[PDB]
């Protein structure tokens, strides 16, 4: 199907407890494949998927180089941010970055992304057309003038549309057996009486990949988003995901309810009846 590569980075300042903590991870779809912890001893980009382990020393040295530079740039960025906003240097702040590209079923470029956050809120982002920046406040406006003057986009765009997609294609192939599989959800239904007049029906989805899924209850065929508890999709820790949807039902009316599941692993959407 469609595929994506993402790098997520977090920098957290520790005023008085030394230099900021810096963590970065890389993903392809939902599968993590790299990591860097500025607090770890190795002090290198470390593999987190068997398939990436193939990469030669040249890979780990260049990648390490880039992510290390980033941690230093982020370190300074937190300092600058304090200046821009005139914040106290006793406070702890967070600086996040998302980078990546999407491609389609044949590995053609789809979309590119390069955006930051400060303290959990949008700071600055590259626009969809990858030619201009969106800045969220006046501070971000300073960074935007500088990046336009510097012509940073020209570089990022060519990278996203060129190096990022080649990289993704390459990763997808080397990890074909893993990355290009789609495990469908094993499903089932549970019943939990709560009162003398009420019971709960829980609709389960297990062992599916990728994470993208839709679980929806119905009553006589009528959608129902009001009376339904839905949990967030959660990893099983083995590469698959889990989720469930639940409704309370009058005792004796379990049969009017149907559960619907949608996942790319399914040739046809599923309808389950108690």
């Amino acid at each position: 199907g469609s595929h994506s590569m993402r790098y997520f980075s977090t920098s957290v300042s520790r005023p008085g407890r030394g230099e900021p903590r810096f963590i970065a991870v890389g993903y392809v779809d939902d599968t993590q494949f790299v990591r860097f912890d500025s607090d770890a001893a190795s002090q290198r980009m470390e593999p987190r998927a068997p398939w990436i382990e193939q990469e030669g020393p040249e890979y780990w040295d260049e990648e390490t180089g880039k992510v290390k530079a980033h941690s230093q740039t982020d370190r300074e960025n937190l300092r600058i941010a304090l200046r821009y906003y005139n914040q106290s240097e006793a406070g702890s702040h967070t600086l996040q970055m998302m980078f990546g590209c999407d491609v389609g079923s044949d590995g053609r470029f789809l979309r590119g992304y390069h955006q930051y956050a400060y303290d959990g809120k949008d700071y600055i982002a590259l626009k969809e057309d990858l030619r201009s920046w969106t800045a969220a406040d006046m501070a971000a406006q300073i960074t935007k003038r500088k990046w336009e003057a510097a012509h940073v986009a020209e570089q990022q765009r060519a990278y996203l549309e060129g190096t990022c997609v080649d990289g993704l294609r390459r990763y997808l192939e080397n990890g074909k057996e893993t990355l290009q599989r789609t495990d469908p959800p094993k499903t089932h239904m549970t019943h939990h009486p709560i009162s003398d007049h009420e019971a709960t029906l829980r609709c389960w989805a297990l062992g599916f990949y990728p994470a993208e899924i839709t679980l929806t209850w119905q009553r006589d065929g009528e959608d129902q988003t009001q009376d339904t508890e839905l949990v967030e999709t959660r990893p099983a820790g083995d590469g698959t995901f889990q989720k469930w949807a639940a409704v309370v039902v009058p005792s004796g009316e379990e049969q009017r309810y149907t559960c619907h599941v949608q996942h790319e692993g399914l040739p046809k959407p599923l309808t389950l009846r108690w």
Binding site: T10, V12, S92, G120, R202, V231, R234, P235, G237
Partner: protein, 99 residues
Amino acid sequence: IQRTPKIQVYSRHPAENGKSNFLNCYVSGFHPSDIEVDLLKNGERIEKVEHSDLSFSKDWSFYLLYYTEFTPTEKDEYACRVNHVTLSQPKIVKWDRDM
């Protein structure tokens, strides 16, 4: 810019007494990133418990997976204990086979 973590505590496979499994605590949708997570076995916190590398979703909220190898029984009760700035007091969630 302050978000309460959603907490889930569950088994990797459906529970089976005397069969080794994995106990997960999934914490997500929180900000900032500082967080303390313990897995509990009858009130006592389990020692060799690991967690995933710190990450975040489209909205910038962080998520982490804590887990450990364990063997379920009919007697043993397990829970997750979680603290975060947005929590008055460490939150404890008992594990439910049914959830």
